[PDB]
Design a protein around this ligand. Structure first.
Ligand SMILES: N[C@@H](CCC(=O)N[C@@H](CS)C(=O)NCC(=O)O)C(=O)O
Ligand SMILES: N[C@@H](CCC(=O)N[C@@H](CS)C(=O)NCC(=O)O)C(=O)O
Lengths: 219, 219
């Protein structure tokens, strides 16, 4: 906490990645919230390039990009539970789907709410459904019967994907489409319950209607 | 070569990342070229998600995304010269600037040639100049007097940035603006000569006018 500070905002899924990873490692830290609508001077100093949260400040050194932050926490506090797979190929696959979720899935998740002003543009709803099917079978292959993407304990892809679960449930209630359930994604449904109930996740996973209130609050 | 195949295209900077990393590790491999304009069925099978090159096929297992590929090669062939820094913070900084070059710099490099049809839209030229200044001082801080971003031998960020040098020189000749030279970027200029002349780079670094011919060939 004296040595570790996290620049972020409570409803941010990427900030949650750092929070979860820090909890897994039992690393204490000070949380500095960003008033959304404007950017703090500390965020500007700490991340002049992207001006984005989260920013992990460890011993007065900035570490930017959530996935890079997760890697860093795992590699520095190496004596704690590993966040990344031990095997090089498992590592590459882990990293691929995390990058996939940020480049493709999450923007397409935002795409359901967004559009223009015609009728039925939401092939976005179809694509989110397809992606979740891709993730469902990805889980089956990676988990191999074990409760998480990373086995016994939550891992890199658990954190990378599970950090979106709140915003997913927001999208579900508003769009009317339940993407993640027992019918469509049976394995992910069971995993989602366990992940959201994990001690390193449950308190930093924001309430759904609370997130929804923020979403509707957002201009 | 029997065990390692690289799906790509010769003028691709991201494919070059894999080629360079493989050379550093002295890992032999078969090269399968993509006819640009269409996508091979192997590329479609090997990368159904992004349908992008490069794809490293190691023991009939696909590894996608160049930076993930670089990580994988470094972590699998771990007995060879390290491509990533040993220190966790140096690792995070390495990864940040690599990600920066792909998200911000290279798209803004393509931005100089691209536009609409008015006059003088190229604040793109200014931004490429600014970014190179950011990279120049980044080099000074990371190299610490040593010839490369990674010290003695080329490293992660050497490969991540140096893979763009051919397309940079193409942009320079066409735009008329020399971005990387002794006046603007003195340290990068000296490094560029060494990197391009490194045995793991020199043969897979395409000729400039040859790249330019491809660029003008490209519709
Ligand atoms: N690639 C970045 C994404 C960061 C990001 O976009 N954060 C959003 C919300 S989670 C934000 O509020 N950024 C400040 C901004 O977008 O201007 C990461 O993984 O850290
Ligand atoms: N993020 C990807 C970028 C891959 C990429 O965009 N490759 C380009 C040229 S280097 C390409 O030809 N992709 C096939 C396509 O864009 O459709 C990586 O680092 O591998």
């Amino acid at each position: 906490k004296s040595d570790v500070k996290l620049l972020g905002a409570w409803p941010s899924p990427y900030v949650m990645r750092a929070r979860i990873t820090l909890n897994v490692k039992s690393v204490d830290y000070e949380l500095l919230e960003e008033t959304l609508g404007s950017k703090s001077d500390l965020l500007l100093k700490s991340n002049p390039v992207h001006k984005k949260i989260p920013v992990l400040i460890h011993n007065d050194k900035p570490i930017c990009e959530s996935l890079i932050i997760v890697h860093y926490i795992d590699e520095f506090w190496s004596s704690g539970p590993s966040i990344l797979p031990s095997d090089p190929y498992d590592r590459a696959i882990a990293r691929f789907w995390a990058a996939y979720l940020d480049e493709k899935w999450y923007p397409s998740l935002k795409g359901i709410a967004s559009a223009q002003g015609e009728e039925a543009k939401k092939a976005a709803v179809d694509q989110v459904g397809e992606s979740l099917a891709l993730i469902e079978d990805t889980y089956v292959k990676l988990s191999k019967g074990k409760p998480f993407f990373g086995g016994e304990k939550i891992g890199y892809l658990d954190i990378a994907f599970g950090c979106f679960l709140g915003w997913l449930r927001v999208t579900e209630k508003t769009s009317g489409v339940k993407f993640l359930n027992e019918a469509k994604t049976p394995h992910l449904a069971k995993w989602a319950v366990r992940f959201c109930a994990d001690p390193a996740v449950k308190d930093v996973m924001p309430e759904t209607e609370k997130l929804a209130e923020f979403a509707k609050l957002l201009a």
